[PDB]
Amino acid sequence: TPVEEAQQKTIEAITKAINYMAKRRIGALLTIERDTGMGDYIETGIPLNAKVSSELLINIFIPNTPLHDGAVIMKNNEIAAAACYLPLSESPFISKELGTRHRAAVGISEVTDSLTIIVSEETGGVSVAKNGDLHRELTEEALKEMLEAE
Amino acid sequence: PTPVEEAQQKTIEAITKAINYMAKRRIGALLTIERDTGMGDYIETGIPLNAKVSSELLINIFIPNTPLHDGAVIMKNNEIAAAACYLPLSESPFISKELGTRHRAAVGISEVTDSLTIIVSEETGGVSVAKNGDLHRELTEEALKEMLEAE
Ligand SMILES: COCCOCC(=O)Nc1cccc(F)c1
Ligand SMILES: [Mg+2]
């Protein structure tokens, strides 16, 4: 169906952008709103309400640019805003070598049903936060499986 | 001011802030503002954004060596319609010989539309505008803003 084709196109755009950033070790933080509304966090960023593309996702996260600091939040198959604030987790069970991007992802996942993707600037490793847990060192296939399951 | 007028002012402020930032850093840029002649054919050649304007997004689009930086951004009213768009190249002899493809594309679209295109030179940081087949170079910040307000 059209709804199904659109969801698959968005998954492909996300995974292509994540692969590019993982290869270049570009830090990234991408939260996908689900049933819990995240308007309060969307409002802290720069409004985009843009069509998803791998190109736009990559351009947003380039280091030392206006939009790269903070989270992209996606809602209703669009990029709602960039450079958004997310709350930092205080969980003592996050790997101690991880920094604020990962703590922000876990933090939003503690108070919403959202799915957040993180690319590490240190290693290019890809992780996902959901339900208060961080799933680390994902393969491309693992991330795709999580997006399709979501 | 009406909301339409306020939105137009917000969009002009976003554009001028972005152009000033890129000019200072010699970031090449090509930004076409659709007017009454529709530019759908050219919009459809690029990557669709249909995004709210911000200075931040305009700057992020044109950063060198990124997916969206080559080609034109085309704006429709208060939105960035698409990036990395094709525009036709002018053959006008009144384009300074040292100028490259962004300036020629800007003049080219200006010959077949009533659009206003802004160009930032990656060589000099100079700012120019193409309208109605003419290129006006080395604009001050004030001159650009006045041209946009008049547009
Ligand atoms: C040019 O292709 C680059 C692909 O990089 C893949 C890579 O190193 N890490 C990676 C990418 C996507 C998801 C994931 F869990 C991990
Ligand atoms: Mg002069």
From Swiss-Prot, chain B:
Coiled-coil-forming residues are none
Query: What does UniProt list under activity regulation?
Result: DAC activity is stimulated about 20-fold in E.coli by coexpression with CdaR.
Stated induction or repression of this protein's expression: Constitutively expressed, part of the cdaA-cdaR-glmM-glmS operon.
Name where it's found.
Cell membrane
Give one GO term, molecular function aspect: diadenylate cyclase activity
- Record GO biological process: cAMP biosynthetic process
> What catalytic reaction does the record list?
2 ATP = 3',3'-c-di-AMP + 2 diphosphate
Task: State the GO CC annotations.
Answer: plasma membrane
**UniProt keyword Nucleotidyltransferase, yes or no:** yes
Where in the numbering of this chain does the DAC domain appear? 2-141
- Its Enzyme Commission number? 2.7.7.85
Gene deletion effect: Increased sensitivity to the beta-lactam antibiotic cefuroxime (CEF), upon overexpression of the c-di-AMP phosphodiesterase GdpP greatly increased sensitivity to CEF. Double disA-cdaA mutants cannot be made, suggesting they are lethal, while double disA-cdaS and cdaA-cdaS mutants are viable. Depletion of cdaA in double disA-cdaA deletion cells leads to cell lysis. Exponentially growing cells are extremely sensitive to H(2)O(2), no change in response to methyl methanesulfonate.
Q: What is the topology of this protein in the membrane according to its UniProt annotation?
A: Multi-pass membrane protein
Q: Which keywords does the record carry? A: ATP-binding, Cell membrane, Membrane, Nucleotide-binding, Nucleotidyltransferase, Transferase, Transmembrane, Transmembrane helix
How is the subunit organization of this protein annotated in UniProt?
A: Probably a homodimer. Interacts with CdaR. May interact with GlmM.
- Main role? One of 3 paralogous diadenylate cyclases (DAC) in this bacteria, catalyzing the condensation of 2 ATP molecules into cyclic di-AMP (c-di-AMP). Upon expression in E.coli leads to c-di-AMP synthesis. Probably the main producer of c-di-AMP for the cell; is probably implicated in control of peptidoglycan synthesis. In B.subtilis c-di-AMP is a second messenger that mediates growth, DNA repair and cell wall homeostasis; it is toxic when present in excess.
Q: Which family does it belong to?
A: Belongs to the adenylate cyclase family. DacA/CdaA subfamily.
The name under which this protein is listed is Cyclic di-AMP synthase CdaA
Organism ancestry: Bacteria, Bacillati, Bacillota, Bacilli, Bacillales
Residues represented out of the complete protein:
103 to 252 of 273
